[PDB]
Design an enzyme around this catalytic site. Sequence first.
Site, PDB file in Angstrom:
ATOM      1  CG  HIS A 276      -0.620  37.094  17.714  1.00 23.72           C
ATOM      2  ND1 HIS A 276      -0.519  38.005  16.690  1.00 23.72           N
ATOM      3  CD2 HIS A 276      -1.234  35.957  17.242  1.00 23.72           C
ATOM      4  CE1 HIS A 276      -1.079  37.436  15.663  1.00 23.72           C
ATOM      5  NE2 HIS A 276      -1.519  36.214  15.934  1.00 23.72           N
TER       6      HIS A 276
ATOM      7  CG  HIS B 155      -2.324  33.316  26.128  1.00 23.63           C
ATOM      8  ND1 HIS B 155      -3.563  32.638  26.002  1.00 23.63           N
ATOM      9  CD2 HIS B 155      -2.589  34.662  26.274  1.00 23.63           C
ATOM     10  CE1 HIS B 155      -4.480  33.554  26.132  1.00 23.63           C
ATOM     11  NE2 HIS B 155      -3.977  34.774  26.311  1.00 23.63           N
TER      12      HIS B 155
ATOM     13  CG  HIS C 272      -1.486  39.394  27.352  1.00 24.06           C
ATOM     14  ND1 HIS C 272      -1.854  39.671  26.038  1.00 24.06           N
ATOM     15  CD2 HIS C 272      -2.331  38.383  27.817  1.00 24.06           C
ATOM     16  CE1 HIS C 272      -2.801  38.877  25.736  1.00 24.06           C
ATOM     17  NE2 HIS C 272      -3.152  38.105  26.821  1.00 24.06           N
TER      18      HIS C 272
ATOM     19  CG  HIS D  27      -5.074  36.135  29.937  1.00 26.65           C
ATOM     20  ND1 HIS D  27      -4.885  37.003  28.953  1.00 26.65           N
ATOM     21  CD2 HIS D  27      -5.270  36.838  31.113  1.00 26.65           C
ATOM     22  CE1 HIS D  27      -5.012  38.190  29.367  1.00 26.65           C
ATOM     23  NE2 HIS D  27      -5.308  38.150  30.711  1.00 26.65           N
TER      24      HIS D  27
ATOM     25  CB  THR E 255      -7.525  40.881  25.588  1.00 27.51           C
ATOM     26  OG1 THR E 255      -6.660  39.816  25.699  1.00 27.51           O
ATOM     27  CG2 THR E 255      -8.274  41.063  26.858  1.00 27.51           C
TER      28      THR E 255
HETATM   29  C1  LIG Z   1      -8.026  30.282  21.143  1.00 24.14           C
HETATM   30  C2  LIG Z   1      -8.058  31.301  22.253  1.00 24.14           C
HETATM   31  O1  LIG Z   1      -8.701  31.251  23.316  1.00 24.14           O
HETATM   32  N1  LIG Z   1      -7.339  32.388  21.974  1.00 24.14           N
HETATM   33  C3  LIG Z   1      -7.205  33.458  22.824  1.00 24.14           C
HETATM   34  N2  LIG Z   1      -6.483  34.441  22.503  1.00 24.14           N
HETATM   35  N3  LIG Z   1      -6.524  35.427  23.466  1.00 24.14           N
HETATM   36  C4  LIG Z   1      -7.231  35.038  24.469  1.00 24.14           C
HETATM   37  S1  LIG Z   1      -7.432  36.109  25.882  1.00 24.14           S
HETATM   38  N4  LIG Z   1      -6.056  36.824  26.045  1.00 24.14           N
HETATM   39  O2  LIG Z   1      -8.368  37.131  25.523  1.00 24.14           O
HETATM   40  O3  LIG Z   1      -7.633  35.142  26.956  1.00 24.14           O
HETATM   41  S2  LIG Z   1      -8.007  33.493  24.335  1.00 24.14           S
HETATM   42 ZN   LIG Z   2      -4.608  36.883  26.925  1.00 27.58          ZN
END
Ligand SMILES: CC(=O)Nc1nnc(S(N)(=O)=O)s1
Ligand SMILES: [Zn+2]
Length: 256
Positions: free
Chosen positions: A61, A91, A93, A116, A195
Amino acid sequence: HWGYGKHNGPEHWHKDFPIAKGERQSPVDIDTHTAKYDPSLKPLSVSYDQATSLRILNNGHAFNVEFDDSQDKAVLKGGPLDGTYRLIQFHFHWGSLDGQGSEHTVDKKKYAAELHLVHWNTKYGDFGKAVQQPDGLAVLGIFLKVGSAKPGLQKVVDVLDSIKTKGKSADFTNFDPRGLLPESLDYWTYPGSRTTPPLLECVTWIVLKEPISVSSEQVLKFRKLNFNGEGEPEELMVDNWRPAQPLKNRQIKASF
Ligand SMILES: CC(=O)Nc1nnc(S(N)(=O)=O)s1
Ligand SMILES: [Zn+2]
Ligand SMILES: [Hg+2]
């Protein structure tokens, strides 16, 4: 399962995760004229000097940079938070184009990408436990605009070729997150959710006002990732963002 495609995209998540149409869903649009300046909002406190990055992996993802959260090595406090929150991962987006990619918008303005940094509230013991509480998580949101290169991000960019497909991982030690922060720690905060599925409503969102600039070539490298697993037809990892959701009552406060 879920993805960001026409047949498994955000518009479909509700069938498997009902909470999709919940009350404190994220991301949202930040209306700067409506945001409430709260003078009781203490300044943010980022203590990332002792961080220990471990690995980088493509989960199918996005790509996550994992950290060692066995001790108060990299924590977040102050701001709107009560207690200490430990960094577990970060990570991004991003979009297929430079005019889309961020999750949160500002006055309806979409950015190239969004960083994030995910943290969990220690009084809860483990991340798993944290996702069971209303104040379980704290996410620090940083917007990326295309302009000048971000030196501090090159390390990340140069390893992406090693984790092209889903399931691939790579040792990623001695990475300093500090290199990803803007000069100002001014922010907006509100009560939301993760999210991506399971979309749990455990997050205290902290979105920084000042974006960070990254070059075209840095963002381009993001866009070469694959959603698919090795030996499968190529599906570029682009537009891994969720549309803004209804604020539904909630008030967005400003530290400025
Ligand atoms: C294990 C963990 O935290 N996974 C997440 N995946 N998306 C996230 S977010 N974009 O909403 O910060 S956190
Ligand atoms: Zn995120
Ligand atoms: Hg929760």
